[PDB]
């Protein structure tokens, strides 16, 4: 037995229906009661911050329904300033017990033709990462069911608690997955894409890249899932599966890399094209001001059980054991936390 609070839909002919996202959202009464929004096949563009608790949007379907916005961190607001990587997301989840299923996120800022502008042309922007959905520090216990989030670099951006995204689709280039959440992915195709301005035997992109706190038991962690090449044109070895991002931070003694963001990024039988070569290093900026790097050798990347032409077993691709692996079950990575759908 499922009833919706709200309708979204596109047609006059529906009747009693919301036409944005963004109103039926907003049409919630104050509170922390179930909320669920079905919203019908269509391309909605919006841009959404969810800050109301237990709040539920369904769409009619995966392929049909779109919530979508063009928005890069270089992208300029009426006051001249950048929007920046976070202020860049389609969806801002700022609450406890948000779910969506069945639906489309997308940021549609065109990093393809953005790079092909000549590089005197006043629009091309150099702040290129384009978030299509972003889990808040605020947020805790998010789920996505059935979802795909599209974009080309950082298209999710996971902060703050627990995220588990579940039969899901994820595309994108350059760090397309990052931040120091609790995120837990299962039977997820994650799809890297062609770069077109990307010389031969330069990297493409990197599936992750992690900020977890040191002292955060988990970070990023890929089950059951299929690590996908867009097309035949994505070049074997093009993909890192992961790069240690240590997030420029305010400090007591100045802005710069946190050397406590220790990244953690697990896959436990997963499977990968050749298109993947390993992990890889990231620069930030020291104390000091000085270029620095940081290796994935220092860092939390693991893997189990991969499978595929990029599954690679070497010193550089550090194994879980049994025993070890079984610290990755979904019962041990959200803790009391049951991922479930209204
Ligand atoms: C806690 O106190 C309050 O309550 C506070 O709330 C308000 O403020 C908000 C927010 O709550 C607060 O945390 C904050 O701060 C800073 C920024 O303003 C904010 O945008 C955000 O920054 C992120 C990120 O944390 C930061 O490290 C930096 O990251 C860049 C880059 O954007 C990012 O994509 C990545 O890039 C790598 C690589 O470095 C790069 O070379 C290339 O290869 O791309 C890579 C990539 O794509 O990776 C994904 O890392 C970069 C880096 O490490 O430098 O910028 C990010 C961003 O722009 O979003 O957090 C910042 C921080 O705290 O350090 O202020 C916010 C705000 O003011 O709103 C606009 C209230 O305003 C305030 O009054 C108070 O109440």
């Not at 890192?240 to 697990?266: E, K, M």
Request: charged share 20%.
């Amino acid at each position: 037995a499922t009833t919706y609070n709200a309708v979204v839909s596109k047609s006059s002919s529906d009747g009693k229906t919301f036409k944005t996202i963004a109103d039926a959202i907003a049409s919630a009464p104050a509170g922390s009661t179930p909320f669920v929004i079905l919203i019908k096949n269509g391309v909605y563009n919006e841009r959404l911050t969810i800050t109301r608790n237990n709040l539920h949007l369904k769409g009619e379907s995966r392929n049909g329904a779109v919530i979508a916005a063009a928005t890069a961190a270089g992208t300029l607001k009426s006051d001249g300033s950048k929007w920046g990587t976070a202020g860049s997301s389609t969806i801002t989840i700022s609450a406890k017990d948000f779910s969506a299923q069945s639906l489309t996120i997308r940021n549609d800022f065109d990093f393809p033709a953005n790079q092909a502008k000549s590089d005197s042309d006043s629009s091309k922007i150099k702040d290129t990462q384009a978030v299509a959905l972003y889990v808040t520090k605020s947020g805790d216990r998010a789920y996505f069911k059935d979802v795909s989030l599209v974009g080309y670099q950082a298209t999710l951006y996971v902060s703050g608690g627990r995220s588990f995204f579940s039969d899901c689709r994820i595309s994108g280039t350059v760090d397309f997955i990052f931040g120091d959440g609790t995120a837990l992915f299962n039977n997820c195709d994650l799809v890297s894409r062609y770069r077109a301005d990307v010389k031969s035997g330069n990297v493409s992109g990197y599936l992750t890249a992690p900020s977890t706190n040191i002292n955060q038991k988990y970070g990023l962690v890929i089950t059951n899932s299929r690590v996908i090449r867009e097309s035949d044109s994505v070049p074997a070895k093009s993909y890192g599966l992961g790069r240690p991002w240590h997030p420029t931070t305010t400090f007591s003694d100045g802005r710069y890399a946190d050397p406590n963001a220790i990244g953690q990024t697990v896959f436990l039988n997963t499977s990968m094209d050749n298109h993947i070569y390993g992990w890889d290093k990231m620069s930030g900026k020291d104390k000091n001001g000085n270029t620095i790097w940081f290796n994935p050798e220092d860092s939390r990347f693991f893997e189990y059980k991969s499978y595929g032409a990029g599954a690679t077993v070497s010193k550089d691709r550090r194994q879980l054991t049994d025993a070890q692996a079984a610290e990755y079950t979904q019962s041990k990575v959200l803790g009391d936390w049951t991922p479930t759908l209204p």
